[PDB]
Amino acid sequence: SGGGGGILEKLGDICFSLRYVPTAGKLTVVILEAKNLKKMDVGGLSDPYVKIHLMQNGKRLKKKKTTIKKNTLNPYYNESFSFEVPFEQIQKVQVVVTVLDYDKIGKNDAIGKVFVGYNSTGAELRHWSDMLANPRRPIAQWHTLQVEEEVDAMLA
Amino acid sequence: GGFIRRVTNDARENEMDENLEQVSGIIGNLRHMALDMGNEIDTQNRQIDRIMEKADSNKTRIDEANQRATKMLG
């Protein structure tokens, strides 16, 4: 979140809700709204979208994505993703959230990224702990985006 | 457990035989997995032709429709 360098470069704040059920092993992640994103192109308007990847000890597994919300720096998604993770195996995993802009030319750069799971501090650690503890939690939390190599250095 | 010609009665030789047996069974699983993967990917690659032919047909149909609509303008 905002204790990283992404506050200085004004990357933007994203709001999401994490919920798990330890007894049944099912995991649901809901991406809500974001506010004040950094604009990547100089003269156009950005079309922001989010890609979310599940990992085990920093080892990539599979990913899902939001619908694209065009011409905005304040996108509203309210989109839900559901998975299954065993109770002995939720204590081995991380979830990585990356936000990107949509230009058709290709070689797209990330706006910024964040992760939840072990190897974290503050807000990121709290949201993961709260998710594990509370069955079917409806509460959500804001996380400021951070630059890619700061996230790599933090995760390591 | 009988995967190699044992030359000694050591625990080190015993571990070697079990470790090689475990490696061999994973390779035998990978052989069948590769055959499944090749069967699915070849079928998927030829699915791209099916999608592409339909895509060009509808794009060409849209070009015909655009030309046809434009020719009624005056």
């Binding site: 949509y102 058709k104 290709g106 | 190699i4 010609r5 030359v7 000694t8 490696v23 390779i27 609509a69």
Partner: protein, 72 residues
């Protein structure tokens, strides 16, 4: 006949070769996994351009059906 040192030294030689046979297979899987994942990033562009085209077609056919209806 059969001799113990010759058997173990030769067997070790074949085992390190077997490890390097698996190493080529491993290198192929890591490059293949990167390439199919990278192609999956490209498919997102193809999917969105097609879905955006569906919105234009759904609008265009609807407006075309409205347009023809005025002919008596």
């Amino acid at each position: 006949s059969k001799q113990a040192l010759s058997e173990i030294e030769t067997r070790h030689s074949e085992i390190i070769k077997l490890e390097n046979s698996i190493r080529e297979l491993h290198d192929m899987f890591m490059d293949m996994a990167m390439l199919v994942e990278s192609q999956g990033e490209m498919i997102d562009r193809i999917e969105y351009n097609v879905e955006h085209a569906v919105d234009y077609v759904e609008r265009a056919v609807s407006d075309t059906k409205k347009a023809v209806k005025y002919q008596s």
